[PDB]
Each structure stands twice: as structure tokens, then as C-alpha cells.
Paper text:
The conserved core of the monopolin complex comprises two nucleolar proteins, [name] and Lrs4. These proteins form a distinctive V-shaped complex, with two [name] homodimers bridged at their coiled-coil N-termini by a pair of Lrs4 subunits, thereby positioning two pairs of [name] globular-domain “heads” ~ 10 nm apart at the apices of the V. Each [name] globular domain has a conserved hydrophobic cavity implicated in binding the kinetochore protein [name], leading to the proposal that monopolin could bridge [name] molecules from sister kinetochores to physically fuse the kinetochores.
We therefore screened paralogs from several related budding yeast, and successfully purified a complex between the [name] (Cg) [name] globular domain (residues 69–181) and the [name] Box 1-2-3 region (residues 14–72). We identified crystallisation conditions for this complex and determined the structure to 2.3 Å resolution. Our structures of the Cg Csm169–181:Dsn114–72 and Cg Csm169–181:Sc Dsn171–110 complexes reveal a consistent interface between [name] Box 2-3 and [name], while the Cg Csm169–181:Dsn114–72 structure reveals a second interface between [name] and [name] Box 1. In the crystal structures of both Cg Csm169–181:Dsn114–72 and the chimeric Cg Csm169–181:Sc Dsn171–110 complex, the [name] Box 2–3 region wraps around the [name] globular domain, with Box 2 forming an α-helix that packs against the “side” of the [name] dimer, and Box 3 binding the [name] hydrophobic cavity. While [name] Box 2 forms an α-helix and associates with the “side” of the [name] dimer, Box 3 forms an extended conformation that packs tightly against the [name] conserved hydrophobic cavity. In the structure, [name] Box 1 extends outward from the [name]-[name] Box 2-3 complex described above, and interacts with a crystallographic symmetry-related [name] monomer. Interestingly, Box 1 is oriented in the opposite direction across the [name] hydrophobic cavity than Box 3, with positively charged residues (Cg [name] R35 and R36, equivalent to Sc [name] K75 and R76) C-terminal to the hydrophobic residues, and negatively charged residues (Cg [name] D29 and E30, equivalent to Sc [name] S29 and P30) N-terminal. Thus, both [name] Box 1 and Box 3 bind the same surface of [name], through similar but distinct interaction modes.
Numbering used by the authors:
A (entry chain A): 69 to 118, 126 to 179
B (entry chain B): 67 to 179
C (entry chain C): 29 to 65
Write the structure that this text describes.
Amino acid sequence: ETIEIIKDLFEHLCGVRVHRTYEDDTGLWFDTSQGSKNGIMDYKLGFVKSVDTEVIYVPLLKQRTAEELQELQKKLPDYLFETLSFPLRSLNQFYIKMSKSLNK
Amino acid sequence: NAETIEIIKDLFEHLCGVRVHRTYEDDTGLWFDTSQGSKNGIMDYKLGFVKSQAENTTEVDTEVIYVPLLKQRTAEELQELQKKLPDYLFETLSFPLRSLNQFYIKMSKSLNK
Amino acid sequence: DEGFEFRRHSNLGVPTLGERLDSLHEIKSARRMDHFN
């Protein structure tokens, strides 16, 4: 079992790639990419522990061309265009929301 | 959650709802003993990847083998899944790697029913 | 010889100076949401 083997599995399984990661003083952070042929969204997930764990979602529009972001504008609810905080128990719900939005 | 690989697997378990319990490779391919689900229901299954060498390239062809694990589930849990999941998810299935995300989506929508 | 306080970290990676800044800003400005039902 290697990290590359796990990352490969989940790329093909649930369409999520992890690109860059780091731990700073606030928590654990993951530059993340999600989607398929229909649409792709890049974003940052941060896990900050206070013990309860909060997730910070940061949308990343730089990699998107002008055309795929006007599609993104139609597919995404407004909150997925803004930086969010939510408890860890809702992460899967978040993934499903993002999947359904991209798949539109 | 000290080791980096545990952190990665914890991330995907909370994000995609899939826990990988074991990873191994024997003469039958590369295998993952997994669980997928949440409060709404859990499905235990093995994912197998059978790499066959392509004719003209180092790029391997991959076939996925899905083996559902029902033997250790209770009859009560097994009848709860039967209402949510189509019959083929109770059988051993094989399909190309490219269909793996569709399999996962079909699994996820069934468990969330 | 009095010892010191520290904090443990994983090997997930050292951030840049900018990413440290980004994290604080993103936490501070994040909109709270409870679920996505």
C-alpha cells in the first residue's frame, strides 16, 4: 500500500485528484480537483481542529478557461463560488452537492 | 492519523464515503477490501484491478472486478440493501476501469436511497 | 535547561509563506454552512 496507489484508486473511483498538500499552524490543507468530462472544479479543503474538526472550502478559479467558468456559473450554486466553513460530518454531503452540480 | 497515507485515506473516507480496509496484490491482481456508505447503509465489497498488457504500448489495459461481500452481513441488513440496490450489485461484476466512476455513482445513489 | 513548548506536525508538507497567510484569511472570511442536504 502506497499513497500513489490510494490516490489512483480514488481518482478513478470518485473523480477526485489531490495535487498539493501542506500542514501549517492552522491545520491540514489539500489542493483538490473534482469532476469529469462534463465539468471540473478545483478547490482547497482545509481541516482545522478545535475536539471538533471544521472544514474550510476555498474555490479556485484560476485554472478555468473563460468558457468553462461560464458553464460553471450555470451549474454551481452561489455558495460553491464562495469560501465556506462546515463541520467534518458534512464533507460527503459537500462532495455529493459538487458532483451533482458538475454533472448538470 | 499521523502517517501521511492515513491522512489521505481519512480524507477520501470522509469525502467519498469509501473506507479501504486492506490493499494487496497477489496472482489474481491488485485488490481493495472496501466499505462504502454512511448512516443510510453500508455495502462491503472488494475491488479488483486486472492489468493486461496492451498490444502496442506500456499503457496497461485495466479490467475492474467487483466482488460484493454479503456473507458477514445480517439478514436484516441484507434485506434493507435489497430494496435500495439493483440485483447486479449482489453479484460479481466485471467492467472496464473507465466505468469505475459510474459504478461508484450507481453505488452511492443506491445507498442514499 | 527548562524544556520548551512545541506543536507536532505530520509530513504532509511545509507551506509557503503565502499559503500560511492564505489559510488565516480563508478561515477568517469563510461563510459558515452546516450541511448541504
